[PDB]
Design an enzyme around this catalytic site. Structure first.
Site, PDB file in Angstrom:
ATOM      1  CG  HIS A   1      71.216 -55.556  -6.360  1.00  0.00           C
ATOM      2  ND1 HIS A   1      69.940 -55.675  -5.854  1.00  0.00           N
ATOM      3  CD2 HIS A   1      71.984 -56.415  -5.651  1.00  0.00           C
ATOM      4  CE1 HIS A   1      69.936 -56.572  -4.884  1.00  0.00           C
ATOM      5  NE2 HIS A   1      71.163 -57.034  -4.740  1.00  0.00           N
TER       6      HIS A   1
ATOM      7  CG  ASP B   1      65.768 -52.784  -6.665  1.00  0.00           C
ATOM      8  OD1 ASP B   1      65.859 -51.949  -7.587  1.00  0.00           O
ATOM      9  OD2 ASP B   1      65.722 -52.463  -5.457  1.00  0.00           O
TER      10      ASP B   1
ATOM     11  CB  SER C   1      71.605 -60.782  -3.839  1.00  0.00           C
ATOM     12  OG  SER C   1      70.791 -59.996  -4.684  1.00  0.00           O
TER      13      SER C   1
END
Lengths: 51, 151, 151, 151, 151
Positions: free
Chosen positions: C28, C50, C102
């Site tokens: 993402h 992901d 992230s």
């Protein structure tokens, strides 16, 4: 008639595109002096003629 | 940073400024802006003022240069020193300013930007600057003294 | 270094890391890895986790992080300090983590990777983290709390 | 800098030398030139000399190493140490040379380029070098021992 | 004095000198020589070498600079300082000389003029000069580095 009609449409397209192009050019040139000056008078008349 | 150099072949070919949330650079200067945030901005052309313009990212808008049109007679500041403002003309000493200095900002004594230097005139003892500034109504105008040459 | 921030418009919105010879980036997180050698490798997708992954270049294979599936109860660390691992979930004090973290790995007391943080959930006292970890059999699993948000 | 490294996968695998106002790089050394101005010039190939060459930027025409065709018996130097020249052969102590040293010139006691090294052979006492040099007429001549491996 | 400036509007465009008994000035230098004895001489147009030349009056024969074709490698003097000569090229440090210096002589250690400067090229840290020189047989020749701008 075939030749005449095509000539009429060709004339209209060139004239309308040129007319709008100049009017779009007018708005760009007319409004730009105020785009680069956020702290400007920006008269109400300007919003009616150049927009 | 308030002023960002423009690099063409590794050398600085001009400078871009951010004023009031908008970024400006000389129209005649080719190259990338030496700033990852500013180098990605697609700018609009303004042939009236010989400059390109556009908005900056939301993170930069908070610390951009302040616009002012308040230009009383006196001395103004810029990167290479002082600027004299008389008779509605901006001048600097001969030998101060040249090729590659295009786009530099000129500020008053209050830190507000009054003009963007795009060129100038090489006179016998002084120089006149070709700049974009604002008139008494706060509307953008281009100042081009006779004989001005883009820098 | 071992951790390589991912930049989109000149700002970091996530981090890539190299674990056991593979370069792992969140799926993402869109942007370019802040590197020159590792940015040229084509990445395979692992959207069920992901993540995206690829092979480390020969010159970088030795200088990579090691990981372990052994997660005894106690304290684990990462870039922002201590991380608590209890009730099978990694959690950090409220406000310690957030968007932009992230792909940041979590390390044990020996500096070995135990999980890759992809998001989190703000609980009453600590923020629960959405991580990619290895279960009791060492198989890759996506360990997420209820209502996690991508960071 | 007068000798510039060549990089292929981020590591240095040879050198490009600016000698006589011209850029000299080996053909077997693949990669870009470190300097942006030296890397931007299109180069010509001379397979009979295992080197590729091209004209330097205007500013680099003076900042170049001078070369000589006169190499009497004696000692010469390069970045790996001293070089001994006897019987028309450039011999260096065992283990001094190796992969990544190709393209570096061998200098005399006056700082002039005597030969460009491309490879060598381990003879068990000293290492014989494969060089690109000049004969007694000043003509570019490649000088290699039998079995030399490109470096 | 053996060097006389040439002025068109009171500013110096170049210099004239008496070498070997002849008056020399470049073709591109406009104006009149401050010394009336030289200005009144009708000069022949040597477009072959970009020089005007004529006969020194007998009253001025004593004000003659000796010239020679013997120019071994080394350093030579001129009005702006030292000149480095190698490989049949006359070179001066960057910043030494420019427009207005055309027609100046280059002198050796015995006071003999070895060359007359017509122009030059900026080559990085050093500037090459376009000069009119005599070859090993004493025959006048013109040496012009590529891109030389007349001074």
């Amino acid at each position: 008639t075939i030749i005449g009609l095509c000539t009429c449409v060709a004339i209209i397209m060139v004239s309308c595109v040129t007319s709008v192009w100049l009017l779009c050019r007018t708005r760009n040139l007319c409004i730009t002096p105020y785009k680069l000056a956020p702290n400007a008078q920006v008269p109400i008349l300007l919003a009616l003629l150049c927009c | 940073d308030k002023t960002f150099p423009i690099m063409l072949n590794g050398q600085v070919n001009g400078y871009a400024c951010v004023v009031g949330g908008r970024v400006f650079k000389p129209l005649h200067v080719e190259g990338r802006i030496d700033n990852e945030q500013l180098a990605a901005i697609k700018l609009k052309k303004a042939s009236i003022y010989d400059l390109e313009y556009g908005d900056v990212p939301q993170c930069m808008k908070s610390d951009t240069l302040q616009y002012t049109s308040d230009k009383p007679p006196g001395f103004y500041n810029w990167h290479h020193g002082a600027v004299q403002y008389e008779n509605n003309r901006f001048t600097v000493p001969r030998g101060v300013g040249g090729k590659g200095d295009s786009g530099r900002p000129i500020l008053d004594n209050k830190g507000r930007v009054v003009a963007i230097v795009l060129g100038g005139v090489n006179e016998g003892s002084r120089t006149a600057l070709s700049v974009v500034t604002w008139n008494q109504k706060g509307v953008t105008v281009k100042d081009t003294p006779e004989g001005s040459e883009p820098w």
